[PDB]
């Protein structure tokens, strides 16, 4: 079955840095 996506809003996380 296709990947649902994480439309989670800002209130779990917080905001930290991803890879760049």
């Known amino acids: 079955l296709e ?3 994480c439309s ?3 209130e ?3 905001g ?3 890879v760049f």
């Open 3 to 5: 990947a649902i996506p």
């Open 8 to 10: 989670i809003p800002p």
């Open 12 to 14: 779990f996380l917080f």
């Open 16 to 18: 930290k840095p991803f």
